[PDB]
Amino acid sequence: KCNTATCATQRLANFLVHSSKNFGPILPPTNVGSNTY
Amino acid sequence: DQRNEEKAQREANKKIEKQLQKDKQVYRATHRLLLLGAGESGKNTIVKQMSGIFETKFQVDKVNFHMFDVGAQRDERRKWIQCFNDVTAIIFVVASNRLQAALKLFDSIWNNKWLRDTSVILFLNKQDLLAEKVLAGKSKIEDYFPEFARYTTPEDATPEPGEDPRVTRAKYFIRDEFLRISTASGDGRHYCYPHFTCAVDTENIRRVFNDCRDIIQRMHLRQYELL
Amino acid sequence: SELDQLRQEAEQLKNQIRDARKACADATLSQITNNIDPVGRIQMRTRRTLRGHLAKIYAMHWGTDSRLLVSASQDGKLIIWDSYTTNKVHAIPLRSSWVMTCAYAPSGNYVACGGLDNICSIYNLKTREGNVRVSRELAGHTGYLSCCRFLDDNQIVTSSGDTTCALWDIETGQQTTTFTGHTGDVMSLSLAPDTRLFVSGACDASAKLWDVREGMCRQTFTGHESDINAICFFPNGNAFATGSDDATCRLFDLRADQELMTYSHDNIICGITSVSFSKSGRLLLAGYDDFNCNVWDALKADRAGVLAGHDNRVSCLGVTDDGMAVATGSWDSFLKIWN
Amino acid sequence: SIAQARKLVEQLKMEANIDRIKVSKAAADLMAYCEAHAKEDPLLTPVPASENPFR
Amino acid sequence: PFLYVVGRKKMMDAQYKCYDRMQQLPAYQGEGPYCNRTWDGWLCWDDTPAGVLSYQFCPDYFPDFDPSEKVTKYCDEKGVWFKHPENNRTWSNYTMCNAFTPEKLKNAYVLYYLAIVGHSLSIFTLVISLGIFVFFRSLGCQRVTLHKNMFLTYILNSMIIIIHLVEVVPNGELVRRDPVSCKILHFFHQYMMACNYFWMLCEGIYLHTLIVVAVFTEKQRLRWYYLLGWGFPLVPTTIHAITRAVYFNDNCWLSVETHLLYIIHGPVMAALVVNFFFLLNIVRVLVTKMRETHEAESHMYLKAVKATMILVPLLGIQFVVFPWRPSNKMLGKIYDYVMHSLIHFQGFFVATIYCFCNNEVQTTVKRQWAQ
Amino acid sequence: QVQLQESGGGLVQPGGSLRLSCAASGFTFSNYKMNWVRQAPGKGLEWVSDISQSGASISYTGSVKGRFTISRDNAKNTLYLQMNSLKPEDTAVYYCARCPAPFTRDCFDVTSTTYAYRGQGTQVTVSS
Ligand SMILES: CCCCCCCCCCCCCCCCC[C@H](O)OC[C@@H](COP(=O)([O-])OCC[N+](C)(C)C)O[C@@H](O)CCCCCCCCCCCCCCC
Ligand SMILES: CCCCCCCCCCCCCCCCCCCC(=O)O[C@H](COC(=O)CCCCCCCCCCCCCC)COP(=O)(O)OCCN
Ligand SMILES: CCCCCCCCCCCCCCCCCCCC(=O)O[C@H](COC(=O)CCCCCCCCCCCCCC)COP(=O)(O)OCCN
Ligand SMILES: CCCCCCCCCCCCCCCCCCCC(=O)O[C@H](COC(=O)CCCCCCCCCCCCCC)COP(=O)(O)OCCN
Ligand SMILES: CC(C)CCC[C@@H](C)[C@H]1CC[C@H]2[C@@H]3CC=C4C[C@@H](OC(=O)CCC(=O)O)CC[C@]4(C)[C@H]3CC[C@]12C
Ligand SMILES: CC(C)CCC[C@@H](C)[C@H]1CC[C@H]2[C@@H]3CC=C4C[C@@H](OC(=O)CCC(=O)O)CC[C@]4(C)[C@H]3CC[C@]12C
Ligand SMILES: *C(=O)CC[C@H](NC(=O)CCCCCCCCCCCCCCC)C(=O)O
Ligand SMILES: CCCCCCCCCCCCCCCC(=O)O
Ligand SMILES: CCCCCCCCCCCCCCCC(=O)O
Ligand SMILES: CCCCCCCCCCCCCCCC(=O)O
Ligand SMILES: CCCCCCCCCCCCCCCC(=O)O
Ligand SMILES: CCCCCCCCCCCCCCCC(=O)O
Ligand SMILES: CCCCCCCCCCCCCCCC(=O)O
Ligand SMILES: CCCCCCCCCCCCCCCC(=O)O
Ligand SMILES: CCCCCCCCCCCCCCCC(=O)O
Ligand SMILES: *[C@@H]1O[C@H](CO)[C@@H](O)[C@H](O)[C@H]1NC(C)=O
Ligand SMILES: *[C@@H]1O[C@H](CO)[C@@H](O)[C@H](O)[C@H]1NC(C)=O
16 A cells, blocks of 8 residues: 555545445445344 | 838837847856956956956856956046946956045945945955055054054964964954944945955856845845845 | 135136125025926836946937937946837847947937047938948047937037037038046036027036037036036026036026026935926926936926846936927946836 | 146137127027927827727 | 445455464563453454553444544453443544544535635636736747646646545535546646656756756757647556556545555656745855855845745745645644645635736736726 | 035144035935045045935944044035044045935945045045
8 A cells, every 4th residue: 555645645546436425336245244254 | 011010110110129138148148347446456366367348257166257447547537336226236346545545436336326235245345455554554644543452363364374364453454444434334235245365366267156146135125025 | 826826816716706696596496386386296207217228328319300209228238128019120230349328319310429538429220231330430539438419410519528519511521629627527418499509417516518610608506516417408508417426406697697506405316317398398307326216396306216127237218309308328238218 | 747738728708709699588588499399299198090000 | 335345345355364463472570450352343452451442443334433533442440341331342442533523524615625626726816827928929938838737737727626626525416326427537636747847846846957958058948848848648547547446446546545646646646846946946055155255144044045936836835845634633733724724725825926916917917907 | 407516625624523524416416325425636436425315324433433423414415524633645636426326225326436426525635
């Protein structure tokens, strides 16, 4: 993962795109309940 | 024939503008210097080391310098000295009361409104002549400069190993006479570079090159608001 | 002693001249023009900006066609401009870069210039090959050349820092007449309309009227407090204006032999570098060290307008022969045409 | 300083014996000249762009 | 989904790596019984003593998993792994791994509107600044010419960043489709970002060529600066896009997990490090000139710090002194607040310092106002 | 016209006192820095002392410090030079010299041989 300061804007953009935002998550949220490991 | 008349004008203006670009590079590459000094200050010998005005050209480290010395001009300088407001530096040669007259002329140059942005390279010449008179002791500087009897050689002084304190204190007092004028005003737009020089010294041309480099370096620092 | 007798003898004449001038001063110009309408607000705009000079401009001169003009810069170049199209007609490299004056011949076939080289150089613009070359170098002055003005293609009058003015024969290159009497550097000259007389201003705070044919000084005008940097004849040839380092402009009358009007203001504390009259003489334009040009009402001594489009010291200005436009030169290396 | 003074006094005599008109008369001719050429002065009265070569 | 295929590969990598690790380590030695080593569906656990809670970082398989958080697995005192009470099955605790908690989302939207405002304020001041340098021809020089190009990089980089954060980041439907139009905007964003950083290097090279080496100069050729600021950034951006379209073709090339990003960020970090050595040489040269004029030691420090402070936004020194986000949570939060402010307001800082507060600019526009 | 007329001077025994006066006319006296210059027999012109417009800044040549006192009165348009403890080397023609331009820090050419803004001088002879 790009950790340098020049990647800060990209990290914010990549974090927000995976949050639900307007049309829902890019990938289904991970279930961490009793059924899962 | 209206189009053909204006066409030749644009073509003639094109040839002129092309020539002006070549002259612009040459004009901005050359550093112009004004050499001022009394009749017996020793500046004539410095020109030998290398008409209303004389020109002298010399190159140091691939840098071209154009030095100008006044020829057939009257001693009234308040008008023609304005032509040298854009020179890189004024080289002021002083023979170490002729000394008081040089201090007054330096004060007028340093405080002239058109020369406010012009640095001065001060050549305290006749250092070997000055040394002989101090060792003899017949003529005392205290008679023409009463504050010299209470003067003390500065701590930052750097005299030669083969020099007595009588000559070191005498030449540094004359330097402080000019430095008091230069540091009294200016507010950092121009500076004074004093040097203990001799007419035969070979470092004179190198001293002008180093001061000009320092002048240009501080001009660049000023354009970036760094100094 | 013998010196006291002659010095007092000169002192008695100065009282006689001052008393005679006082007798003629029955009423001042400001009182005679008290009832005329003011010119109002003079709003001139920059119409052309002439670029190309590398260093500060010291002088300029309009051609008699009111279209071409020559300018002199201390980068060592004379440039002839077509003020209508801003195109450069000629670019003349100078042998000495410290040029302080330039002149345009009335015929348009020659230009002159000079400066710290103490030489007035004549350049032929109508060379057969088509390249401007030096036609004559006028040497003899022992000081810098401050001003020059053509009488014709063969005669030119020069002023120099050697406190003298001279009339030259271009074909022979000799000084036909030398005008002496000033005690300071002569900074400017202005020819009468009929070229019979000319006036000169010097660093002795005095202006002198000279006879070209006889070579003697007809009248001497005083009143300024410092060096006179500029001078210009009134269009009728019966008066002239001067600009000095005392931050004032003054109008002098030849037939009255005394000053008529002073153009000054409390805010102005900088010297005047150039003066010129409008075509009718109603407007007196003046360049200042404060980068601005002031338009004065010559009859009422009131300021009528300001030309403030320069970023450095205004060194010269000129009005065309037809009176249509005014050109201003400055140390910012630009010339501007105002209308 | 003796030879320079003889010419200064002699020059002052030439400038002293001249005919001088009244200032009011001299001021009247300057005023009459301006009004006579007022219409011929483009800087005093700006002309339209059709007559102005610079526009 | 491509990220799903990426997530499954890491799991299969760790599954085989755990199967090999469990065979490597020998048996445990302890008086009390020990929970046997095992591989749950996501992580590897070693032999654990009874009554001990084992800690381990969260995996990087999914976007909603934060690798800074901890995974816990409890071993009962009887010697058996903890079973979830609902289903009575062996269960590991991954509840803390969620990266989109209400608290973590609140901190990210603060950085989000910090970027939109910083780039908006930058555009407003740089457009005005660029207009002042374009319209006032008297200010023209070689320094102003480079400033104009430097100003335009900040303007274009800010406009594209706002487009990316407004038209791409919120629209999840567009990102899930993965069109070529958003990979186009990424190529332009990366190009203008690299152009922005290399024009900071162009400014540093020019200033270090004025103050330190070849001081007389007057013969500088802008051609090489134009090629460095506008031309060279096309080399790493094209090489990156090719490898990205081939090897890591994620949705709109948004992922920062791949090391292919160092194709662009590697060179720009090296260019800003050079700018750091230029800064030290220019401040050192400046200090020697204050000593030659015998400036007071108090006035020497306040003017050397000032010269250093005004050169930081121009040369991008903040990227060199803080080039690595800390692992700690409290330090990482402060790093984000500090670095995002310095990054998104850099264009505004440059326009305010080098145009608005420039003495040559002020006296030029103040004279025209009085005119 | 600008006129400077010096007065005073004459024959004085060595060690005596002398006061010189300079009546100015033809210019705004308060706007100009004033100077005193002298020309010894057989020697050139040399600067003696000057005084600022308001009289705040005052300088002297080294040979006369502690013995000469310069002063001005802008109301009466006069310049003064109080000469005390006169020596035979002080024998010279003393001139009243005005700086060429008003509102200026610099003062050029006041010691020139043909400077215009300078009086005709007054003879001071110190002899027994
Ligand atoms: C004085 C003369 C110069 C003036 C210059 C002015 C420059 C612009 C200043 C703008 C100030 C207002 C910014 C508003 C930001 C968006 C509003 C929105 O409601 O967010 C508010 C706030 C908290 O957001 P949230 O509730 O987490 O959203 C939750 C969102 N959900 C609900 C989707 C989860 O936004 C936060 O990001 C706080 C930071 C705001 C941005 C920086 C503000 C400071 C700018 C300083 C500029 C300095 C300029 C100096 C000039 C001299
Ligand atoms: C933005 C926030 C951070 C700002 C940081 C600013 C740092 C610089 C500011 C201070 C500069 C002057 C002092 C430098 C440190 C001390 C140097 C040694 C002591 C010293 O003065 O040495 C002199 C000779 O030069 C030497 O010995 C070599 C001096 C070399 C100086 C190099 C300076 C590099 C600055 C780099 C800054 C990087 C900032 C990054 C964010 C001789 O002195 P003496 O013996 O005659 O008298 C000493 C009286 N005490
Ligand atoms: C005036 C207003 C504007 C300015 C505001 C300034 C605000 C200052 C306060 C906030 C600063 C930012 C937030 C803190 C960031 C700390 C970064 C360094 C700490 C750190 O983690 O060190 C390493 C990373 O950096 C490294 O690898 C070492 C750092 C790189 C050094 C590069 C050369 C620097 C030369 C010296 C310049 C001056 C420096 C001081 C200013 C190890 O990382 P980890 O992942 O193991 O962390 C594990 C948890 N700690
Ligand atoms: C034209 C005239 C001359 C102009 C000269 C230049 C002027 C520059 C003006 C500043 C521009 C850059 C700074 C932007 C604003 C400050 C941002 C600070 C951090 C921040 O986001 O503030 C709050 C969060 O702070 C926190 O949660 C605590 C953060 C603590 C560390 C802050 C470090 C800042 C470092 C950068 C400073 C740069 C200064 C200039 C050099 C907002 O979030 P919130 O209030 O919604 O949070 C609610 C939580 N319950
Ligand atoms: C936002 C995206 C679409 C931008 C993509 C890049 C290009 C479309 C543009 C943006 C900035 C432009 C540059 C902006 C400024 C200059 C300087 C310019 O040179 C000068 O300004 C010198 C004087 C002159 O020739 O006018 C030469 C073109 C260049 C490199 C431009 C080349 C074309 C560039 C790279
Ligand atoms: C994303 C895409 C659209 C970017 C496209 C960028 C190009 C339009 C840029 C990149 C490199 C640029 C070139 C970089 C350097 C130069 C040299 C430059 O030379 C000068 O101006 C001469 C200066 C001198 O030596 O005095 C002229 C522009 C030019 C050809 C630039 C033209 C525009 C170019 C090709
Ligand atoms: C996510 O949940 C929110 C994403 C976003 N919400 C917004 O509020 C977006 C903010 C709008 C940005 C507007 C900035 C444009 C200004 C650009 C120029 C300003 C100054 C320039 C002068 C010339 C959403 O869309 O959902
Ligand atoms: C030097 C001071 C300049 C002041 C200029 C004030 C207006 C600048 C532009 C501000 C844009 C703010 C945009 C906020 C957008 C948002 O909050 O979503
Ligand atoms: C200034 C940045 C502009 C970015 C514009 C990105 C979208 C236009 C460029 C790609 C057009 C061709 C592909 C369109 C999508 C499709 O194939 O359906
Ligand atoms: C489109 C161009 C592709 C090739 C680009 C190669 C990298 C840039 C080469 C020129 C670098 C010049 C750096 C500054 C030099 C200087 O200032 O003297
Ligand atoms: C500026 C040039 C690149 C712009 C972005 C191009 C994106 C193309 C579409 C995504 C990549 C598709 C896969 C290409 C390679 C392959 O066929 O495996
Ligand atoms: C300066 C040139 C840099 C070129 C870098 C090229 C990197 C190529 C990496 C290829 C993928 C290697 C790792 C396997 C990834 C996968 O499983 O697809
Ligand atoms: C300018 C200095 C650095 C230049 C070379 C950069 C090398 C980057 C190497 C990246 C390797 C990426 C391997 C595959 C990563 C992945 O896709 O998971
Ligand atoms: C200017 C140079 C910048 C260099 C930036 C390097 C950033 C870290 C790169 C290594 C990340 C950790 C993974 C290494 C994997 C490996 O080496 O195989
Ligand atoms: C892939 C390589 C990227 C390299 C990025 C950093 C380039 C730094 C270039 C510095 C040039 C310094 C030139 C000094 C000599 C001079 O121009 O006078
Ligand atoms: C744990 O591993 C040991 C191996 O030493 C084995 O004997 C024991 O049966 C295992 N227990 C469980 C519950 O798997
Ligand atoms: C899992 O972890 C959370 C957070 O540490 C804790 O509150 C909880 O008790 C743990 N166990 C279960 C079964 O959730």
